[model samples]
Target: MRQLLLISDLDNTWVGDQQALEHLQEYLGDRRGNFYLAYATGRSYHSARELQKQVGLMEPDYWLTAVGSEIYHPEGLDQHWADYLSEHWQRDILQAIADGFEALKPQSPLEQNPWKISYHLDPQACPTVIDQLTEMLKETGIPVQVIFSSGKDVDLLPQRSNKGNATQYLQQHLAMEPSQTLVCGDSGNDIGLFETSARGVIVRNAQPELLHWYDQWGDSRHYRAQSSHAGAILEAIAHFDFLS
Candidate 1:
């Protein structure tokens, strides 16, 4: 089986701190080609590609973008990770969500329509209201997935997709055995990936509920890395037997 290293959620995890980037330069950036760095994020393909250029990440073999709604090859724009999404249930799901968000524009501080066509909910909204909104969205006859993260703006992805699914896609593409892969993230949306991966690494920025969930479902097996980006990378390397 092929060996692969999976990374999810790059916005806060990747370019958040200069120190972390500097520290990562020693481990990840220095020997960047050794492992595949696939990420599942809420950002669009355009945004993720721009960030990839900004961060100088060439290690990740594939870029999983729009939270699995789309995919891009890390090396070039030639690859189409969005191929399955084009004919799958995604377009129908996306249209319904777009309609809902358009109708509720006056109710949010959320950003406008996406250039790449995914939808997002504001994370700062009251939890009860957000719950109600999610249900209302469900009533729109669309099968969309709402990722309400405590640390980020809520994201609406395709009904058939999740970070875990993205991981599976990478595994199949690389022909990797499930045991060789590890997953990491620090939010509620991250739960699915952690549950599905061989091992999960929960970062320090995790909320109380997430921490509790980890305790209950995660069996206290999480690595509570420092609350900085560099700390996250280093902690993963040190604890996950990267050097060996």
Candidate 2:
């Protein structure tokens, strides 16, 4: 028996395409135990849960929440994952710095986490904002990493706790090979996941920058889907010949 893992982003990449979503959902639902599904999103657990319910995504084997600063499973939060991330987190200080930036607007409390601070900023100011935050945290020695995505959002997380790291962690935890895993995404935040060794799918609706970025990595391990969201997922499944 082959163990296949599918780690995907939510929002526009998975939940928005009603028809495609229904198809992918039904297909995965029928397969059940043959796959390990994980959702890696910037959404808070509460938001992800509500969205999951609305979209009817099968209960994921793992949830990579808060830009991958938090990890949870059916059994509950993964303590080992939490402890490893906590050691490098300084979310409060990052939030404090963001408060001082006129360009930064804090997101709701639910969007914030122990290791991640969420905010909104103009896309034009992204480089400047990241520079300012990077310099500030450098002086304080907080070891922070910033993710600017969708042209308006910013997430400050522990240096080691983004989607890529979290996905790799889960991959190791589950004892899966890179070839056994598939990742899908449609935006800047999902860039980290693309950086990993796992095979990837860049949904048709993905931003131009994201598409161009993935191309730089060459095409050997990635696929550019002809469709969006769940349609894109199904396309990749076929591309990889997963059904065979």
Candidate 3:
């Protein structure tokens, strides 16, 4: 019900600094009912939920999980959003196609989400794995976006389902202005959120891919924090003057 929104990635961005993390938790918890909060993460619902419990994190109002292939509120998954992604995604077909490539190995079963397929990329692949896979999918009339993160993990998702589109969907659903939103993350998987018009924070400890994204497309609306972990987010909150 509020225009002010904060969506953050969980792993390094929200959890690395326990002191800063708890500080942020307490800060947000005190203002819990006053603003909207969500988490955009590569983690699955159950996995992310368990981590939340482990860390005693403040509960998110909505979840953009599995590279933003799944969106949820406390009630349930957003079937409308799922419908949008479902139009172009053929999960089983993709599984078959990806299996044909020896260079790509499936990530753990738990990392697989309904709208996402993850792989551990081999550095010694004969052809550039992403390029080969992209072309194959294109020729097969299956459109997907490839995200290579941590220089090892790859995720495939419906072409339009990502943190960018997912965040926009949430914004549109709330009828809120882009300026009212702030997103923070620390890795390549978090690139889509940074690409959105909503303000973004790239933590100091961010992986190289995300930092490269900032170099290529960052704007005044985006902040490259000198601070790492949750300190970066806290700095962003103050820099943007999110609180009065």
Candidate 4:
């Protein structure tokens, strides 16, 4: 039974850049020994690998990617993740593409992939249009999931997927109770985690929907701050009484 603190999203929620990571190190230190540090994000295994390379994180005990639809272990990255996708996601995506599901148009790296199913219109697609597309996708006889990412793009994962579901997976695998987990994020993809966790925090710069969602959840356990990235996290650590 590990006392875990699940941190969702990496781009600007947990660690920002080289400089911010250094700041984080001062507070978090080396966590591999006792504490359980897990990542629940919308990034694919491949994307997670790139992020590790870019930020130089030593990987966590459990890595939840593709917004909880995929999970991996750091010890055996290649084999573990390769087998995971092969066993689960690979068939889903291949079937969707084969059925002429109008699956996503893959971009370089930063583009939001609809669960590798289909890439819909960029940020321009309104929620109404998105709904229509989703209905159409359902007609394809393939499951499609959606994650809102800071208004820049919407993530379409498998029918049953998202960041929070990944949070649930980590909770069970790591034996972490929801009340003990601390979720920090700044996007629509993070809503699932926020709704599921006992403590949900949103940064000031996050999309407006998150703010409204946080508001809807009430203020008793949920906290909101106007800081960005490390600044916001540090503030949260202090606010949550994690720091003296």
Clashing pairs in 2: none
Q: Tens-digit lDDT track for model 4 on 19-117?
A: 656676566664445456777766677777788887777556677776666666656443433344333344444434434533334444453342444
Model 1: clashing residue pairs? Answer: 20-230, 37-60
Better structure of 1 and 4 per TM-score: 4
Model 4: residues >4 Å from true position, as ranges?
30-34, 75-115, 118-120, 123-127, 138-143
Which residue window of length 10 is worst by lDDT in model 3?
Answer: 123-132
- By descending TM-score, how would the candidates be arranged? 3, 2, 4, 1
- Tens digits of per-residue lDDT, candidate 1, 1-244, equal 3344756577656556767766776666666656677777666666766887887744467766666655667455423445544433444455555456532222132222221333344455445655766786677665566666653346665565667777777777777755666677767666667766555577776656567778788743456677555467667667766635
Question: Which scores better on TM-score, 3 or 4?
Answer: 3
Q: What is the C-alpha lDDT of each candidate?
A: 0.61, 0.85, 0.87, 0.62
- Model 3 / residue 137 / CA error / Å: 2.3
- For model 3, what is the error of residue 118's alpha carbon versus the real structure, in angstroms, after optimal superposition? 0.6
Q: Pick the candidate with the highest lDDT.
A: 3
Query: What is the alpha-carbon lDDT of model 2 when measured against the actual structure?
Result: 0.85
- What's the lDDT of the predicted structure labeled candidate 1? 0.61
**Clash count per candidate:** 2, 0, 0, 6
Of 2 and 4, the candidate ahead on TM-score is 2
